């Protein structure tokens, strides 16, 4: 219920979040990963569906959804986890990581003694993530299938009326 905003400073204890936070250069305030997701998925048949078939627009637009996502991201990296259970507090990231480790089952010192190494490992992992999406074409099947199914259903319904259904003729007036 609060649209939190990212701070101007961007030094998160050595971690590098530049690949997920919104990008102001683009007119749309998306991010690099979101940009790749939008490019990979491909959505005049829509104009030919005029025969009584409409596609109403969603209530929420893409910018609004991006704003929600930005609010969540700015909350989870500055307030920790408490912003989902009442008043939103503020905790430095380098020790919220320690709290997460404590939750796992390992003590605190193991983090602070290897802070820089863990930061480098996380940076390398987040960088390598992008290539996996960018290279192969089967990564985003679970969303391509939905739009393909809808297109197939619409095409079948439209093409159905060409069938004569055992009547004299498919065209109405000639009867």
């Amino acid at each position: 219920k609060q649209i939190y905003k990212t701070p101007p400073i961007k030094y998160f204890g050595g971690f590098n979040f530049s690949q997920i936070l919104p990008d102001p250069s683009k007119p749309s305030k998306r991010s690099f990963i979101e940009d790749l997701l939008f490019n990979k998925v491909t959505l005049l048949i829509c104009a030919q569906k005029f025969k009584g078939l409409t596609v109403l627009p969603p209530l929420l637009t893409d910018e609004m959804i991006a704003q929600y996502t930005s609010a969540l991201l700015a909350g989870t990296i500055t307030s920790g986890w408490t912003f989902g259970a009442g008043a939103a507090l503020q905790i430095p990231f380098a020790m919220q990581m320690a709290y997460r480790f404590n939750g796992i089952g390992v003590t605190q010192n193991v983090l602070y003694e290897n802070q820089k190494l863990i930061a480098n490992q996380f940076n390398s992992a987040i960088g390598k993530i992008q290539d996996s999406l960018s290279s192969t074409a089967s990564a985003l099947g679970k969303l391509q299938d939905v739009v393909n199914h809808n297109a197939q259903a619409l095409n079948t319904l439209v093409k159905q009326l060409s069938s004569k259904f055992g009547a004299i003729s498919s065209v109405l007036n000639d009867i």
Partner: protein
């Protein structure tokens, strides 16, 4: 099964906020739950420091966090302000204060330290009295 017969842990499943309990009630073709939950009130902010080095050795909170109001440091819980004096029964040691970043300086006051001092002073006064006889 989860919210009623026990205290759940999945956040935002048995009521918004930290979950205390629930009560069931019937309704025509349905059920109604009353989730009794807990929510932190107004808050104050302080200056923190992840570690403490006293005798050249780092110190970490047992279960809590290190806060300070400007002059004296304290260790407290994570969900309710209640400071205590820094004690060895609240801290555990690891390594030496050279590798961690953000550490600060303070004194670590073991409570067993004055516990044993309560007889160290006894021994000192005994021997001071015994110097002459």
């Amino acid at each position: 099964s989860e919210c009623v017969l026990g205290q759940s842990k999945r956040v935002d499943f048995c009521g918004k906020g930290y979950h205390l309990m629930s009560f069931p009630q019937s309704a025509p073709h349905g059920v109604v739950f009353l989730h009794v939950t807990y929510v932190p009130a107004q808050e104050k902010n302080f200056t923190t420091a992840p570690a403490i080095c006293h005798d050249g050795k780092a110190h970490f909170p047992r279960e809590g966090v290190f806060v300070s109001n400007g002059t004296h440091w304290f260790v407290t819980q994570r969900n309710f302000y209640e400071p205590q004096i820094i004690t060895t029964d609240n801290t555990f040691v690891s390594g030496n204060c050279d590798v961690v970043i953000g550490i600060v300086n303070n004194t670590v006051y073991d409570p067993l330290q004055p516990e044993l001092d309560s007889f160290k002073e006894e021994l000192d006064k005994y021997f001071k009295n015994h110097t002459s006889p």
